[PDB]
Amino acid sequence: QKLTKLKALAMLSSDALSSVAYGTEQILIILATISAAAFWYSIPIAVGVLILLLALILSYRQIIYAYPQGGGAYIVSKENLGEKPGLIAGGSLLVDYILTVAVSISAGTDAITSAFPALHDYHVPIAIFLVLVIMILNLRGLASILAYPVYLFVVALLVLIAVGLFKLMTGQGTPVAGITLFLLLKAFSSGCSALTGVEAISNAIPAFKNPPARNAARTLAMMGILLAILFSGITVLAYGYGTAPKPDETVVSQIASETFGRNVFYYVIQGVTSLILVLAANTGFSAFPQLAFNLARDQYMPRMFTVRGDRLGFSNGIIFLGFASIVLIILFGGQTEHLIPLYAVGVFIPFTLSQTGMCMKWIKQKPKGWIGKMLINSCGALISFMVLSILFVTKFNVVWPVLIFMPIVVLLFFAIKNHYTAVGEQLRIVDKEPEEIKGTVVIVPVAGVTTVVQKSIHYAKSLSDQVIAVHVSFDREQEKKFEKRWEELNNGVRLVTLHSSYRSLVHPFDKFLETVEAKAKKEQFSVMVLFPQFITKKRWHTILHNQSAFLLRVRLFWKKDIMVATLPYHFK
Amino acid sequence: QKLTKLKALAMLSSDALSSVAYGTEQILIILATISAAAFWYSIPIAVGVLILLLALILSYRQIIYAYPQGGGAYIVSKENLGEKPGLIAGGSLLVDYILTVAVSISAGTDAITSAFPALHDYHVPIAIFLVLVIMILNLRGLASILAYPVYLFVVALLVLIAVGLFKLMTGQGTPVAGITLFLLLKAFSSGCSALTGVEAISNAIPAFKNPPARNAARTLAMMGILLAILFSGITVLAYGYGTAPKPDETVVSQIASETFGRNVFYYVIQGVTSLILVLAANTGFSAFPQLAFNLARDQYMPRMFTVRGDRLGFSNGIIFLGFASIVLIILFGGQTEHLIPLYAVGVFIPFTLSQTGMCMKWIKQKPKGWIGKMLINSCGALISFMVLSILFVTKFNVVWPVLIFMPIVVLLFFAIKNHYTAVGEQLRIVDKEPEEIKGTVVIVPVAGVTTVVQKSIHYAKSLSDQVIAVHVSFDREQEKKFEKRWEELNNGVRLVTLHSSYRSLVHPFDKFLETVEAKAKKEQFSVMVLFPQFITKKRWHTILHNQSAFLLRVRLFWKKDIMVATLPYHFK
Ligand SMILES: Nc1ncnc2c1ncn2[C@@H]1O[C@@H]2COP(=O)(O)O[C@H]3[C@@H](O)[C@H](n4cnc5c(N)ncnc54)O[C@@H]3COP(=O)(O)O[C@H]2[C@H]1O
Ligand SMILES: Nc1ncnc2c1ncn2[C@@H]1O[C@@H]2COP(=O)(O)O[C@H]3[C@@H](O)[C@H](n4cnc5c(N)ncnc54)O[C@@H]3COP(=O)(O)O[C@H]2[C@H]1O
Ligand SMILES: CCCCCCCCCCCCO[C@@H]1O[C@H](CO)[C@@H](O[C@H]2O[C@H](CO)[C@@H](O)[C@H](O)[C@H]2O)[C@H](O)[C@H]1O
Ligand SMILES: CCCCCCCCCCCCO[C@@H]1O[C@H](CO)[C@@H](O[C@H]2O[C@H](CO)[C@@H](O)[C@H](O)[C@H]2O)[C@H](O)[C@H]1O
Ligand SMILES: CCCCCCCCCCCCO[C@@H]1O[C@H](CO)[C@@H](O[C@H]2O[C@H](CO)[C@@H](O)[C@H](O)[C@H]2O)[C@H](O)[C@H]1O
Ligand SMILES: CCCCCCCCCCCCO[C@@H]1O[C@H](CO)[C@@H](O[C@H]2O[C@H](CO)[C@@H](O)[C@H](O)[C@H]2O)[C@H](O)[C@H]1O
Ligand SMILES: CCCCCCCCCCCCO[C@@H]1O[C@H](CO)[C@@H](O[C@H]2O[C@H](CO)[C@@H](O)[C@H](O)[C@H]2O)[C@H](O)[C@H]1O
Ligand SMILES: CCCCCCCCCCCCO[C@@H]1O[C@H](CO)[C@@H](O[C@H]2O[C@H](CO)[C@@H](O)[C@H](O)[C@H]2O)[C@H](O)[C@H]1O
Ligand SMILES: CCCCCCCCCCCCO[C@@H]1O[C@H](CO)[C@@H](O[C@H]2O[C@H](CO)[C@@H](O)[C@H](O)[C@H]2O)[C@H](O)[C@H]1O
Ligand SMILES: [K+]
Ligand SMILES: [K+]
């Protein structure tokens, strides 16, 4: 259960070092708006990205040591920056998860269509299909499938880089007009979408070896080095071959095809890239609940997320995350180019907030060597904020959804916090002992003389006396037959048959319950209803059974403050 | 509650006579594939459609008399053709409802964009938005809004027809190569999508005046005459002005603009058409549950639909119908042209089955004048089957989804029927009285000393003795504080504190429940758990509260055959 360095790197790096499939492509797409001759500018810009990457790693190398409990960006932003910055970081992490699912799936389908161009008319269905698949694979459960594909991806891309560099060596500057500083910055910001998951390792510190902090930091350093090597090699290869971004083929696919030649090696590369992107999406799915629990300990998210041991909130979280990702995929049509700016925003707001909190914490404490750590975090935060500002300013026509999504989730967090605050305020205070109860009348609603009915009557009689059976009859003809059949049973239970012409079920019970509750209140008795819970071993018969019980519970019995037992009954 | 003829026509005709907005358009679109000079062929084809319409009306004029209880196509296909034809009719009616929602909404948005061309880039969002709106308006409840717009539509289109005919009179043959018989039949089949809701009146016979059959038949005849007049007038006007189908404007919009001139009259026409199409979609929504109940009486659909008086199944039905319609809208991009063939298939399978059943019933009985009724139904069935065959053969690339949807729903119906058959078989048989119970031990899970906890303890003590409180503690530190606070309460209840390191909640309860259940079984006691049901008056705090209770119920207590009371507690 204590992952070693290699296995931990495999399980947690599938999000970060899987972004090399669409980073250099973004850089080249932005540069191509001027001319194909500007592609050499990818070489410096890429270097700048690595510089940023270095800062991030160093910054997070601090965070892991400062917060060995885990937490990550949310905790750092909460403790050191207050409550609103922490909530903003949480919302941005939610956007990060939704967008990493969407972007990873879209890029995977782009890789697949590059492998088989005949599916270019099904970019969106395939994508959505894949999403649903992993949703199921997360509802069903779910460890080897998350560890080998990353090794395969790293090995395959290292082989591809080596072969491409060898071919370039065997042969198998220049300023260009139009490139202004602003467009260079735009390209750099778009290319910073290669640093889209270095967060993950800092969020899973406990699942490490005996020293958790040291092992996590060394794993993060190794992952950073691997990502830097892969990204630099891919960018160098792309510059070497030219490889302008085609509208129906990824840059990696073009590089592989011009290197190996659409043979088994190329298909291996494409399949492995698709697999690693799917694993990245699954990483987003699996990383959401950790954030949910971290928020829920502070009463910002439902208490149902605080039970982490039983995966209480995993179903709702997985369903909501999958549906949000599907909605985003449909909205942008699976265009990885049009989705990446939003993903970068959702990733870089937490980066900025986390580095700012780190810097202010260092300022507050001022330990030995505080100046260097402060400088590193400050530089990282400045660069990240610049990238975020550029992404807002330029690609607003695809970043508009975050400007709507952030206020909604922040307000939801505040509303939940206020609600739990009020509830905890007025519930903790204890009070006087309630009115005495001298007995209990049990009402058993019956839909027909069955085995389940007789079992429930038996338990009701065991529980207390005064048991009365109640039957709402939709037709006056079957009243006599049902009453006779009940009399055939030798139960000493008074049966009250009451009629409803309009096939309604609540209102006749409303009247009867009024009468019975008044009568019981005269004798200080507590009315109580005993429903059977028919259970079958199919998990899809739930809609087929005992729904009238839920109707009566929800619409009548909760409003009347009446105990409602639910005796289960299994089916063979 | 007993609708008069006029009000009934208004409430039920919003589906049938709202199809004039896209029938002549389909005829013209099919004819335009040859040349604009072939548009005169719309005049004969339209006439043929009316002939078909006449048959349908006559056929249904019989059905209303033969089945005054209602039912409609499903009952006719069930009694006279067997079980599988009845199920096929039911599935096709489900497709009819989904497609009428989708098509009506799409045509409404087409009318809106014709009114304001600036929204042509939002055909699908607007559409989906409208759908969601009516979904809400069907979950909230929902009678005058369903009665006046139909009157407005009829009046407005009658005015438009009169004005257009007047202008044609004041002036304000010719065989064409390429028109083969097959293409004429294709155009006729596509134009038969004007008869897309004459079914509705036959499905709501009881809600009429003192003679239900006569009043329903006369209302159906009046609606048929109105539809014939509107459709014929629209087709004549379209032929008179030429009005080739533009890619960004409905034929009705073109007719109105060339008649009135984009003034307040034209905007009134467009708005009224949009309103009538929205009402048609709402008619589909409201008509689904009648089919659901009719199926459920025969154990083909969940029993939860048999309680028609309390609208038990309306929530699930509305949600599923809305989501299916939204999926179809997105799939075909709100192209009313591409959706109509599927709608016509889903409407005409029931027409064919119903007329065939009517004919065979007449053959079996052979009453006076049987020959004429048999001939009418036979002719209607033959024409409908021909139209359906043509729609399958030609427009397969948009009718493929029904070929997938039909087997799934038919198999679901059969599976549900088999399941209820087995359950009813093995449940009715009564058996020996179960083991005696000599008392009851009550387990009260507590999450902290609160008012709710003390109320639940009070009720548990009232219910029986041997009450024991149980607390799972996620941290050993707060164990002592919680135990001391419990001791501060003077409850004579033994508190068992048990610890779970991984924040799990089921497993410690699993062990404790094993021990307690064994101990109680030694004394023939029945274990029982008492949960509080925290209730707030906001309907959206449901996710915020008492979810651990649902976790414990679902994952632990149903599997152990243990009674689980649920005492409600209201919030102030
Ligand atoms: N003959 C049969 N064929 C198929 N399934 C059968 C069946 N008899 C019982 N069941 C299954 O058992 C569930 C509970 O049956 P019971 O009548 O004990 O429990 C009923 C009864 O306690 C009460 N209830 C239902 N209809 C009622 C009525 N018309 N009048 C009074 N109480 C009614 O609500 C509970 C829920 O009933 P619901 O029908 O939702 O759920 C039923 C159904 O799922
Ligand atoms: N201080 C507070 N702040 C905000 N809301 C509060 C609150 N105290 C109680 N509530 C509300 O009351 C519900 C039931 O509280 P109770 O502890 O009686 O009912 C609990 C208790 O009977 C049992 N349970 C929950 N956690 C437990 C634990 N750690 N150990 C043992 N039983 C537990 O499951 C029931 C469901 O509890 P859940 O927390 O889902 O739902 C809670 C929550 O919605
Ligand atoms: C809950 C309320 C909050 C807001 C409501 C929810 C959103 C409402 C409208 C959203 C959709 C409107 O916008 C609709 O979708 C996208 C917008 O990105 C457009 O489509 C375009 O999206 C982006 C833009 O380059 C591309 O990736 C895509 O290929 C392109 O087709 C559609 O042509 C437009 O019709
Ligand atoms: C059971 C698992 C299998 C999955 C089942 C679900 C199937 C998919 C559900 C609906 C998918 C909708 O797919 C929708 O199709 C429309 C056309 O109708 C596509 O159509 C559009 O695609 C993009 C823009 O978005 C353009 O390149 C293309 O020219 C345009 O036609 C949209 O890209 C997609 O949003
Ligand atoms: C509660 C508040 C609600 C929030 C806002 C509600 C709706 C907001 C959705 C905004 C629409 C998205 O904006 C979307 O942008 C893309 C380009 O990026 C447009 O895409 C379009 O560009 C041009 C210019 O219109 C079109 O001619 C072309 O057909 C298409 O590619 C979509 O037509 C537009 O819909
Ligand atoms: C339990 C599920 C069982 C399997 C379900 C059946 C599988 C269905 C596969 C869905 C494939 C999606 O199909 C996708 O949309 C339609 C099919 O109508 C095709 O294209 C169609 O819609 C497009 C896009 O709106 C329109 O231009 C036009 O109406 C038509 O060409 C798309 O080119 C195809 O990409
Ligand atoms: C709160 C109520 C408001 C509704 C909120 C929901 C907003 C809508 C959710 C996503 C809608 C998706 O809208 C999707 O946009 C894509 C482009 O991205 C559209 O794009 C496509 O439209 C059709 C083909 O389908 C072509 O005419 C168009 O050229 C093409 O771009 C698809 O038609 C539509 O399937
Ligand atoms: C159980 C699994 C069920 C089978 C799974 C697949 C179900 C059927 C989906 C495949 C057919 C999709 O439906 C079909 O999509 C193709 C591909 O866009 C569309 O094809 C049309 O548009 C595309 C896109 O421009 C053109 O390339 C093509 O030449 C043209 O014919 C058809 O108009 C649509 O009818
Ligand atoms: C337009 C497309 C046409 C409509 C789509 C196709 C409709 C028909 C396809 C479904 C046919 C189902 O075929 C049905 O399968 C169910 C599954 O248990 C079984 O149905 C059988 O159920 C049990 C025995 O098991 C018998 O009580 C019942 O009388 C019998 O019908 C039989 O195998 C067959 O009756
Ligand atoms: K990534
Ligand atoms: K219609």
Domains of chain A: 5-422 (1.20.1740.10)
CB B19 within 8 A of CB B226: no
Of B302, B543, B561, the CB nearest to A570: B561
- With b for 16 or more beta-carbon neighbours within 10 A and e for fewer, the B403-440 pattern comes to eebbeebbeebeebbebbeebeeebeeeeeeeeeeeeb
First to last CA, chain A: 39
CB B24 within 8 A of CB B234: yes
Residue B43 structure tokens = 């005049």
Identify the CA nearest to A52 among candidates A283, A352, A340, A252.
Answer: A352
Q: Is the CB of B417 under 6 A from ligand 1?
A: no
SS3 content of chain B, % helix, strand, coil (to 5): 70, 5, 25
Residues A544, B419: C-beta atoms closer than 8 Å: yes
CB B366 within 8 A of CB B159: no
In chain B, residues with a C-beta closer than 8 Å to the C-beta of A427 are 450-452
Side chain identity at residue B451, one-letter code: T
In chain A, residues with a C-beta closer than 8 Å to the C-beta of B458 are 433-434, 437
In chain A, residues with a C-beta closer than 8 Å to the C-beta of B427 are 450-452
Phi and psi at residue A542, to the nearest 5°: -60, -40
Deposited experimental method: cryo-EM
Using DSSP, state whether B445 is helix, strand or coil: strand
CA–CA distance, A268 with A289 (Å, rounded to integer): 33
Choose one of A496, A533, A534 to mutate for the ligand 1 pocket test, by most ligand atoms within 8 angstroms of C-beta.
Answer: A534
Give Cα separations from B111 to A173, A288, B117 (angstroms): 58, 43, 10
Residue B189 labeled ligand binder: no
Q: Is the CB of A407 under 6 A from ligand 4?
A: no
CB A424 within 8 A of CB B452: no
Question: What was the resolution (in A) of this experimentally determined structure?
Answer: 3.3
In chain A, residues with a C-beta closer than 8 Å to the C-beta of B330 are 330
Residues B558, A433: C-beta atoms closer than 8 Å: no
CA–CA distance, B442 with B309 (Å, rounded to integer): 37
Alpha helices in A395-525 (DSSP H): 396-428, 451-463, 476-488, 506-522
CA–CA distance, A350 with A184 (Å, rounded to integer): 24
Residue A145 structure tokens = 């499938």
Identify the CA nearest to B345 among candidates B289, B376, B295, B384.
Answer: B384
CA–CA distance, A364 with A368 (Å, rounded to integer): 13
Q: Kindly give the number of the ligand 5 atom that is closest to the alpha carbon of A338.
A: 18
Identify the CA nearest to B58 among candidates B197, B221, B231.
Answer: B221
How big is chain B, counted in residues? Answer: 572
Give Cα separations from A252 to A230, A338, A377, B509 (angstroms): 12, 18, 33, 53
Q: Is the CB of A323 under 6 A from ligand 4?
A: no
CA–CA distance, A441 with B201 (Å, rounded to integer): 49
Of A543, A547, A565, the CB nearest to B563: A565
Identify the CA nearest to B569 among candidates B485, B490, B487, B459.
Answer: B459
Choose one of A446, A505, A531, A554 to mutate for the ligand 1 pocket test, by most ligand atoms within 8 angstroms of C-beta.
Answer: A446
Residues A450, B427: C-beta atoms closer than 8 Å: yes
Determine whether B68 is exposed, middle or buried from the number of CB atoms within 10 Å of its CB (0-12, 13-18, 19+): middle
Q: What is the DSSP letter of B122?
A: G
Residues B310, A547: C-beta atoms closer than 8 Å: no
For residue A133, give the ligand nearest its CA: 4
Residue B476 CB neighbour total at 10 angstroms: 10
Side chain identity at residue B122, one-letter code: Y
Residue A454 CB neighbour total at 10 angstroms: 17
**Residues with Cβ < 8 Å from A299, sequence gap 6 or more?**
A416, A417, A420, A421, A424
**Ligand 4 centroid distance, CA of A331 (Å):** 10
Residue B365 structure tokens = 């009985």
Residues B547, A302: C-beta atoms closer than 8 Å: yes
Residue A550 structure tokens = 């839920």
B404 touches chain A (CB under 8 A): no
B518 touches chain A (CB under 8 A): no
Identify the CA nearest to A237 among candidates A195, A269, A275.
Answer: A269
CA–CA distance, A95 with A403 (Å, rounded to integer): 11
Q: What is the DSSP letter of B216?
A: H
In chain A, residues with a C-beta closer than 8 Å to the C-beta of B544 are 302-303, 416, 419-420
Q: Is the CB of A338 under 6 A from ligand 3?
A: yes
Give Cα separations from B472 to A103, A326, B500, B568 (angstroms): 41, 38, 7, 22
How big is chain A, counted in residues? Answer: 572
Residue A288 CB neighbour total at 10 angstroms: 24
Phi and psi at residue A467, to the nearest 5°: -65, 130
Determine whether A152 is exposed, middle or buried from the number of CB atoms within 10 Å of its CB (0-12, 13-18, 19+): middle
CA–CA distance, A356 with A354 (Å, rounded to integer): 5
- With b for 16 or more beta-carbon neighbours within 10 A and e for fewer, the A194-228 pattern comes to bbbbbbbbbbbbebbeeebeebbbbbbebbbebbb
Residues B462, A526: C-beta atoms closer than 8 Å: yes
Q: Which residue has the tokens 């239900």?
A: B212
B169 touches chain A (CB under 8 A): no
**Ligand 4 centroid distance, CA of B231 (Å):** 34
User: Residue B532 forms beta bridges with which residues?
Assistant: B567
CA–CA distance, A241 with B392 (Å, rounded to integer): 51
